[PDB]
């Protein structure tokens, strides 16, 4: 006469659903504060007494000890939305939550979950087709590229120098634009100076190990080596039999082998960062070899210029002019440590969106403009498809209006008035009606150069929707006390 040991909760009926959805909702509304270029970062603290001040939702959700199954789902979403583009990370999370909160609402209305999912399924797909009619199609116009990069770098700490990084991120995507290749762009984060001192090296960069070794070797056949040159003379000899002028050792090179290198005119560099050793095999073509008894004349990469310049009083080995110049290395310099690290990723993502422009030539309008259009689209459609499907599709649209609503809240500008101002002015100004926080009023998105990348929104709508559906299909889970 007892199915679960003393202490085994049993979520039944609504309680089960109420608990499930809310859990995700809380996590969704949490990072919600960090919305728009005017949010509120959170000072997270792990178990090692660490102060983490970030505005990026993903990172925030990765440091929070999530003790809820449903929530963990959001951690995934934010982990995907962030590894694909960048911003909007908060969006996808928040939105997904509100849906569930709207779900538990219809449930209280005696509306079976399934029909709810059906409604959202229609609404979502319906809203998708819509984002197409509004999605403006662009096409090497270094102007729009800047507008897209400048909108990705914003809403962050780089917003101060976003203009500087825009030219860099765009300059690299226009040079290495053969089919959108972000694998040919190396990021060099170094401390020493402000963020306005960062540049874009037209080649691979990896910040010698001998004053007798040739510093600047014009034509050098880079030979990558993993293992170190220590137990020595046979090491330098074999390497000399392959005919190399530039030796790159990941590990440490002994003193003796180091002497034979400089005496033989073979510039070497020990202790090479693995990340810097991996790209080298993709920038110059030098195949990485294990022991010195494995490499030959086929493990030699072609480099047209390997010099060492004391940039900012720092010795930087330039491998510029590689066989396939379709590879560079944007150098970032930050005064502190978080600034440099926060800028790095900021560029990484900036490179992603650009990778979407080089393939996905579809762009949208942010500032809650896109959503408000959806909200108005799915609505008219809801009235077309009767049955519980209606209220569902309807509640879906109203849930999409929250995007700009929150964009106005974190602005100090009343949202209740914005929703009406935006929604009404959207039915008159077409899809070119978006919110402008910096003016505290609705403005034209295309006239202000505020445009997001299709991929962004599309992913969100498709993500949250379907995902939530499953979350609404569960009504009895076994977690922890």
């Amino acid at each position: 006469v007892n199915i679960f040991k003393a202490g085994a909760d049993e979520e039944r009926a609504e309680t089960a659903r109420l608990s499930s959805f809310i859990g995700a909702i809380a996590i969704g509304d949490l990072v919600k504060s960090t919305l728009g270029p005017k949010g509120m970062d959170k000072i997270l603290l792990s178990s090692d007494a660490s102060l983490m001040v970030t505005n990026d939702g993903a990172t925030i959700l990765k440091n929070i000890g999530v003790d809820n199954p449903a929530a963990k789902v959001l951690v995934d979403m934010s982990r995907v939305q962030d590894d694909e583009v960048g911003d909007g990370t908060t969006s996808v999370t928040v939105l997904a939550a509100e849906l569930l909160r709207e779900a538990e609402s219809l449930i209280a209305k005696k509306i079976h979950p399934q029909t709810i999912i059906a409604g959202w399924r229609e609404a979502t797909k319906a809203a998708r087709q819509a984002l197409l009619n509004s999605a403006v199609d662009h096409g090497k116009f270094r102007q729009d590229l800047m507008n897209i990069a400048g909108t990705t770098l914003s809403s962050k700490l780089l917003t101060h120098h976003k203009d500087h990084f825009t030219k860099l991120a765009v300059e690299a995507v226009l040079r290495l634009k053969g089919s959108g290749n972000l694998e040919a762009i190396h990021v060099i984060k170094k401390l020493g100076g402000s963020l306005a001192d960062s540049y874009l090296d037209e080649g691979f960069l990896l910040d010698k190990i001998g004053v007798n070794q040739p510093k600047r070797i014009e034509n050098a056949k880079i030979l990558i080596a993993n293992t170190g040159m220590d137990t020595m003379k046979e090491k330098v000899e074999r390497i000399l039999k392959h005919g190399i002028n530039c030796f790159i050792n990941r590990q440490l090179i002994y003193n003796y082998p180091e002497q034979l290198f400089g005496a033989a005119g073979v510039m070497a560099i020990e202790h090479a960062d693995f990340v810097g050793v991996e790209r080298l095999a993709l920038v110059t073509g030098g195949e990485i070899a294990s022991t010195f008894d494995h490499p030959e004349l086929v493990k030699l990469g072609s480099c047209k210029l390997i010099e060492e310049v004391m940039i900012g009083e720092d010795k930087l080995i330039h491998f510029s002019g590689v066989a396939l110049g379709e590879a560079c290395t944007i150098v970032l310099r930050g005064a502190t440590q978080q600034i440099l690290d926060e800028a790095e990723r900021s560029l990484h993502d900036a490179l992603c969106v650009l990778a979407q422009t080089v393939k996905d030539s579809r762009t949208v309008y942010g500032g809650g403009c896109s959503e408000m259009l959806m909200a108005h689209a799915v609505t008219q459609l809801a009235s077309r498809t009767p049955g519980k499907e209606a209220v569902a599709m309807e509640s879906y649209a109203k849930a999409l209006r929250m995007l700009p609503t929150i964009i106005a809240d974190n602005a100090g500008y009343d949202s209740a008035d914005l929703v009406a101002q935006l929604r009404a002015a959207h039915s008159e100004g077409k899809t070119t009606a978006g919110l402008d926080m910096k003016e505290g009023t609705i403005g034209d998105m295309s006239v202000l150069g505020i445009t997001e990348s299709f991929q962004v929104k599309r992913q969100v709508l498709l993500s949250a929707a379907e995902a939530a559906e499953v979350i609404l299909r569960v009504d009895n889970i076994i977690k922890a006390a």
Partner: protein
């Protein structure tokens, strides 16, 4: 004095009935939600913090903290149902509960437990009599088979390509059909490619050494060789003086020996696991010889075709068209090994349902149609036979309406209002009509192509009936500790 120590639980009188009722009814209500294509999924997170999103009852009960004896019994019903045919692991659970849910009623009326089992037994014995009456004995019928299989691969993760899985299932069963043996069906599973790539080989798919070697041997003379060809001209010469054109080494293979064998035009595969080497001998007939000296002209196997094909950049050796391919091979490819696991399991069920069919030409109609027809029969037969067993049969029938009622429930439509149109449209247009959870209402199942093997329902009633009966005979359980 103290008969039973502490840490026990003694159920006497109506205490035993009640406990089981509320305990089972609950577990029956849990699975009931996951019934049908609209089934509500569940997340079973044990104490290790591992997630378990499954739609199968057995998979949910195998991770549910079951302390009560009654509940454990329901866990043995889905497990048994899942270890025999698998399909419908949900039904038996929900079914068992319903019966008990009704039983309690008869109990509170003063009707003794034993008696309840009686009526439910006679009624069940008749429930089958009817289900085996409405059936339409299916035809080597390629049309119906592929259909039945699709009715098992639906509402699952392999639904996106249920067509390919069914096709393989039919041929696999038809080939090893002679009474069909599920052993003559080898299910090889390896990472690589997708689900759509899954195929079926009329031979043995053993999971080449040299390149230029014949990547296409017609009627090979497989020279099953164990000992490695390591420390090469004389060793490879003898293998060519026997007539063999396909060398199969169980151990190493010296490169030097590979080139020499190449000049002879004999493709060979080194490092062939023991099992593989043994199976290949059972497929082509080739005899396993030790040293390369015992290799004669009668130890050679004969395979219709031996070609190494890259199944999604996963190159493997295929030994099909053998003389006596008593052992078939179903190669299930796919990306995430997790998705495949789902496909391999469903395949099992897809193949078993066909077998139960081939060895019994009788099929019914799902959607509850059958359940309704029975519930009606049992009721009328309950009247034609008075005695206290009358009320029993009636209750039994009422418990045969749950399945359908549940369908309408999980579909979103009011279970009651649904059965209204069902029971009506059913008696008017024969039991060939059921509940279409897709169109929300009634419709002819035979037309919607929603058929299900007779053994499915047949066995379902049995298992559930037998277990429930047992519990009914349980009026006291002294459990120490």
């Amino acid at each position: 004095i103290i008969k039973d120590q502490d840490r026990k639980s003694r159920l006497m009188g109506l205490e035993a009935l009640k406990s089981h009722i509320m305990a089972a009814k609950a577990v029956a209500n849990t699975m009931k939600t996951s019934l049908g294509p609209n089934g509500l999924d569940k997340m079973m997170v044990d104490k290790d913090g591992d997630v378990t999103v499954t739609n199968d009852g057995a998979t949910i009960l195998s991770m549910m903290d079951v302390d009560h004896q009654i509940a454990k019994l329901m866990v043995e019903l889905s497990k048994s149902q899942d270890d025999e045919i698998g399909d419908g692991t949900t039904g038996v659970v929900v079914l068992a509960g319903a019966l008990l849910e009704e039983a309690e009623q008869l109990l509170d009326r003063g009707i003794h437990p034993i008696r309840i089992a009686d009526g439910y037994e006679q009624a069940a014995r008749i429930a089958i009599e009817h289900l085996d009456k409405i059936s339409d004995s299916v035809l080597k019928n390629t049309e119906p088979l592929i259909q039945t299989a699709k009715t098992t691969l639906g509402s699952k993760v392999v639904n996106s390509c249920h067509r390919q899985m069914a096709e393989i299932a039919v041929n696999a069963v038809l080939t090893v059909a002679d009474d069909v043996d599920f052993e003559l069906i080898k299910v090889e599973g390896k990472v690589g490619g997708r689900l759509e790539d899954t195929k079926l080989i009329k031979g043995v798919i053993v999971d080449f050494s040299h390149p230029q070697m014949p990547k296409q041997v017609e009627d090979a003379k497989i020279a099953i060789l164990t000992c490695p060809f390591e420390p090469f001209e004389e060793m490879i010469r003898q293998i060519k003086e026997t007539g063999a054109n396909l060398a199969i080494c169980q151990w190493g293979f010296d490169d030097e020996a590979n080139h020499l064998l190449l000049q002879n035009d004999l493709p060979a595969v080194r490092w062939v696991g023991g099992p593989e080497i043994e199976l290949i001998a059972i497929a082509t007939g080739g005899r396993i010889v030790p040293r390369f000296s015992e290799l004669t002209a009668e130890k050679l196997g004969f395979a219709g075709l031996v070609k190494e094909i890259s199944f999604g950049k996963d190159k493997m050796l295929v030994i099909e068209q053998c003389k006596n391919s008593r052992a078939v091979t179903i190669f299930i490819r796919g990306g995430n090994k997790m998705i495949i696991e789902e496909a391999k399991r469903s395949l099992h069920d897809a193949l078993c349902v066909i077998r139960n069919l081939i060895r019994d030409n009788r099929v019914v109609y799902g959607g509850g149609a059958a359940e309704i027809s029975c519930a009606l029969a049992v009721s009328q037969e309950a009247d034609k036979c008075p005695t206290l067993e009358q009320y029993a049969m009636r209750a039994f029938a009422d418990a045969l309406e749950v399945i359908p009622m549940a369908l309408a429930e999980n579909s979103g439509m009011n279970p009651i209002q649904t059965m209204t149109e069902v029971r009506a449209r059913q008696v008017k247009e024969n039991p060939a009509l059921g509940i279409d959870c897709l169109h929300k209402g009634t419709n002819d199942m035979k037309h919607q192509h929603v058929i299900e093997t007779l053994i499915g329902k047949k066995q379902q009633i049995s298992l559930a009936t037998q277990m429930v009966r047992m519990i009914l005979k349980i009026d006291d359980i002294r459990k120490p500790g």
